[PDB]
Amino acid sequence: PAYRILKPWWDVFTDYISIVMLMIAVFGGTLQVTQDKMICLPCKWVTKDSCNDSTGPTGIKYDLDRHQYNYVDAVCYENRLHWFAKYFPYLVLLHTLIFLACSNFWFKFPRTSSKLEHFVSILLKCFDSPWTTRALSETGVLDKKEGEQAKALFEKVKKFRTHVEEGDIVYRLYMRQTIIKVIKFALIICYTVYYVHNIKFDVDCTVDIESLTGYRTYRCAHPLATLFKILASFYISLVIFYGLICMYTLWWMLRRSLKKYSFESIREESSYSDIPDVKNDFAFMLHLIDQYDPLYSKRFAVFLSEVSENKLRQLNLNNEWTLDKLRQRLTKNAQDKLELHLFMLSGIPDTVFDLVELEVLKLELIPDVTIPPSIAQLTGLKELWLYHTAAKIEAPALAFLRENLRALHIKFTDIKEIPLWIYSLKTLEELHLTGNLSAENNRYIVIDGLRELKRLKVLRLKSNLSKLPQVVTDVGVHLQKLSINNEGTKLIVLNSLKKMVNLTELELIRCDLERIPHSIFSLHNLQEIDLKDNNLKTIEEIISFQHLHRLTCLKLWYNHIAYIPIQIGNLTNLERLYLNRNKIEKIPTQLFYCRKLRYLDLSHNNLTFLPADIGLLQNLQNLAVTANRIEALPPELFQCRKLRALHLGNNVLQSLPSRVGELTNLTQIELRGNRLECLPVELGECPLLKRSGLVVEEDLFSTLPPEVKERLWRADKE
Amino acid sequence: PAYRILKPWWDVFTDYISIVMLMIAVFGGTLQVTQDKMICLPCKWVTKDSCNDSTGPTGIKYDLDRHQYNYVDAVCYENRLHWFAKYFPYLVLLHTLIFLACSNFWFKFPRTSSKLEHFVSILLKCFDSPWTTRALSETGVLDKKEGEQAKALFEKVKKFRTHVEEGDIVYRLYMRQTIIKVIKFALIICYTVYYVHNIKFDVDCTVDIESLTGYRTYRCAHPLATLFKILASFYISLVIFYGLICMYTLWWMLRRSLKKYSFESIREESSYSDIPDVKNDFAFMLHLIDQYDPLYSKRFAVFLSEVSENKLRQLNLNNEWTLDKLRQRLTKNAQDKLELHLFMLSGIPDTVFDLVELEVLKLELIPDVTIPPSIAQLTGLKELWLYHTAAKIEAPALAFLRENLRALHIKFTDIKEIPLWIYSLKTLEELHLTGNLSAENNRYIVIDGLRELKRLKVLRLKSNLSKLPQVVTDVGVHLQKLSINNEGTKLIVLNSLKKMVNLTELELIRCDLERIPHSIFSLHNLQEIDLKDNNLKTIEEIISFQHLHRLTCLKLWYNHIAYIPIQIGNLTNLERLYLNRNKIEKIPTQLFYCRKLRYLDLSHNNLTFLPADIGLLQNLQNLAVTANRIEALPPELFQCRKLRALHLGNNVLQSLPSRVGELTNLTQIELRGNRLECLPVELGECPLLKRSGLVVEEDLFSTLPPEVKERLWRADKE
């Protein structure tokens, strides 16, 4: 009932033959025990120890008692009867017992019985499971219990295959059994056929007992000799059949090299082309199964396809990730949109396509995943972020992304990681490419699809472009933003940056320009310009920067600018400025002639003084001079009545003048790290300054009057 | 334990006959073993080696010992008794064992045992399924798992049919078993009938043993001969019955060609004519079941019919989407009409036709659906939407569609999936085509049937067409509204718009025209014209637009329009003008002669100040200058009394004049992004202004007077 699957036709035939042999043995034994008498009549004329057959006919007088006849019969039966006639039932019993022992050797040997039982259990589990049925049907909806059962079955199959493939004990044990059976059959046939002629009805007895009966030789009849001969002939025929069956088994084991299973037909007909071929000690068991039924091997093959594992994992992650877990995983990014982050997942769960409130989706390391058509359900989806993930798409999904998606973020490290269908997404407007794409004589060739992005407005190219692609220059005629981050790689434009007339913004970070090209001056639509991390040394080209009519901002932080050019104040259009973390030695008053200035940082500079005209910028609300050599705070600086926040910390400023409290728009002050003695009393009269905005050292905050402390704490808490 | 179903009645009769034959074999064998002695008396006078048969009578003295009598009996039993008389029970036992082995060959042969057990297991699983009961009762809502297991049963039945139909091992094996039984019966009856005549009570024995007893011939008696003879006659009769049953089985198996099955009663009493004929290796087992009883075959044939599978799969789907949940999913579209969408469904539920009040029906990604006649019930249906859903149709459904529809939405990714019967419709007013269709050597051939619509009024095209089709020009003689979306690809017209004399509204979306074609001006009856995102810079052709007197609304936004020509003031008929997202920097003074303007859009442009002539446009209500360079709000703007919308966000607005309260009709305004330090007191006197209509910073909202804040809160609350 359990191992019957492992018994082919030859095994069951041999079992039935052994049963018949046991019946023959017991019948012969009980027949011999019940009666096996001899009937002996003495020879009156004895020659060569056998009588020569030398009014009406009359009987022969022997003058022998019945007891003497019984004694003669017993003596002749014990002595002159061939051992084959006396021991045939016991010999056939022994032979069939040894045959049964050989047959059950592997079943009763633990070192192989455990493997056989485990294989039977694994095959039954793979056959009766419902997952294999749908796996064959597919050539998706699944239950959690079914998913966990299938996962357990897959791991059990893998561990069992790993354990069994290196054994190679069942095959050689079966070979030994077959060889033993064949040689035993041969020897039994030879000896039994040669000795079956030694049992006969007429047997001549010469036991040499004349002191008790007086006769030398006796002619004895064996009444059951014919029946025993018939039984022996029938047993010989059964042994011939058994040996022919064993020889068929031996031929079957030495014809196709059962150490190897090709497994090609099952994998090719089931579309599971990547099914590895079975090695030794596991191909033999599958050969036995095929002899029994190929259907079990067919149902078991789907657990070794290297694809059904991926499908089962995808279904399991679909089932396990509930909607509530994803809702708890929802995040609001800096742009105030519902973000759902997926990281370290083999595939995209299908449950994420149930929350239509998703706005920005980030995918990171999602290998070999295909975009499901269910993406059309997420109407509110706006941003798709791919991190080192080469994913496939479907026609309905492609159409939905072409007609709904607006922003795409791409982080990659190889050409194959860039989906080819991103070009057809014509509603895409915000693009973020992160990853090297420069190639030797192949650069910017597969990137000709940028023309298709008609609605592209926001572009970010991070590929260490030592050469600027001409396709980007041609497509910039409708772009509005372009931030190129080369990670310090030098930027070469070969006079191709003046063609993007509609480029409203231009950012050059880590481009290592070392000097401002003249093509920036042709960007009359420019409003915010930055050369951060370009190690710029001179910015005197602000003279030619005057062409930019609507240039409302200018950032030059994190550079080697040694001084502020006198021409920078002539661009009255400038409103926001970033000049901190530079090597500026002194600040000329020329810059302070752009009275609409509102953003200006001078932190982490070698400045040791503050000019007089700093207070003439009444629109300024951000003063960041953190970690400077400024040691005296000028009273004229306090004229900026609209200075919401100022940063003075880490400086060498000795004290804060009393004019700080004259500002009612103050909200935040950064003062930690200064050579300050005590905060002024006037600082506590600011209606909008609180402890959140008043960040200073512990002792400096302790220098304030207690009423100022309690007012600040009450304002901050309530 | 009900494996007997595969055994017909004749198999049971043969098994019982074999049991009786085995019983009589055992009886005869134990009788012969226990007592089979022969009693022999020598003939004093012998003629022809036979008994001569020739103061009162006295017994004849033979002078023979009892042991000599026993020897004579044994030698006569060995030699002169016929082998059939001695070995009748053993031959009967051997033949009975051979018959049982033949009967149980296929039952125990693993190669066909697997097929038999799989067939009986599938039959028993099918029999207990409530699916069969429901199908029979069809001549009604159950558990979902019942439908799941029904589909699993259907799939496994199909797989088993595909597997077993290729083998053909059970029919040939059964035929060979029957042939072996018949030939064995013939041989056994021949030899037994021929040799039964030798079972005689008296047997003439001439063993020729003179040196032992001294008599030539003997006259033996077989006391068991009569019982053996009657047992032999009984066994002959049983063998005759067995052979007759075997001949009947052979005739039944060699007359109807069991390699094929009819399956004709199902398509008559149930009209399930989709069941194919069953070929070998499956028809044989079905015939055996029919021999048992045809009920199992009848209740199992339904699983081979795909029509029953489809109908009860649809029934399961209807059970999945109940009416209450269907109406829960029922919503209202953007046109305030009842709409229902079906996404990622295997088929269209029948329950969707319960609600006849639907007007818009969305069918997206519903594979291989045929439009049923049940759509005729939904007389109120007006719009049917197809999103990548290839749909087949029937005559009544198409008849209902041709006279009870308003608009049709067709979204496709491939040419072959669009329905072709759409052209037969005549009640259709709006047709929505979505998907690129242009190809070479078959250009614009799929939509050649668009001319069949003689009532087509509004045409909406999403096909990315390089050139305007001639069929569009042919069908435009009666159109009213045209919406073209080239997805940013440049469109070539070549004077192909003047043929649409009755066209009312012309819409060109993402056509990348870069220049307005002159055929637009020739449509004197045009009402609304759009050039949405067509890379237009100059619109000076308005001199030609002056031919269009009834151009109430002109849409020229999402383009690169640099400056508005002064000739736009000639078109005083403009009422709704969109000019946002353009390079427009200033409003011409002549534009204000168009006093009919009511909707003006200028957001996200280079506007810096508003002309003083804006106050003369009293008809204006909606104004949008969001994200511009507006330094301050002009005073003359406040005299436009019925301005219901003023979008001034993301500007550089500094001071808000107190005259905002003069706009009693002002409802919607925003102050985000504008550096407004303070607010006037008249802002809270406008009845139509509410807190939800006031988009302002929370602290700047607190800057409102507390009475004004309470008034705005009261307005917002109710």
Swiss-Prot record, chains A, B:
Highest taxon, organism lineage: Eukaryota
Glycosylation sites: N52
Compartments where found: Cell membrane; Lysosome membrane
Short sequence motif Di-leucine motif: positions: 616-617
GO BP annotations listed: aspartate transmembrane transport; cell volume homeostasis; chloride transmembrane transport; cyclic-GMP-AMP transmembrane import across plasma membrane; intracellular glucose homeostasis; monoatomic anion transmembrane transport; monoatomic anion transport; positive regulation of insulin secretion
Extracellular side of membrane: 34-86, 197-226
Membrane-crossing segments per the record: 9-33, 87-105, 175-196, 227-251
Cellular compartments per GO CC: cell surface; lysosomal membrane; monoatomic ion channel complex; plasma membrane
Paired cysteines (S-S): C40-C220, C43-C51, C76-C205
Disease the record associates with this protein: Defects in Lrrc8a are the cause of ebouriffe (ebo), a spontaneous mutation that causes male sterility. Spermatozoa present in the epididymis display severe malformations, mostly of the tail. A drastic decrease of the spermatid population is observed, whereas spermatogonia and spermatocytes seem moderately affected. Defects are caused by decreased volume-regulated anion channel (VRAC) activity in germ cells. Oogenesis is not affected but embryos derived from ebo/ebo females show early developmental failure.
UniProt-recorded name of the protein: Volume-regulated anion channel subunit LRRC8A
Organism whose genome encodes this protein: Mus musculus (Mouse)
Lineage start: Eukaryota, Metazoa, Chordata, Craniata, Vertebrata
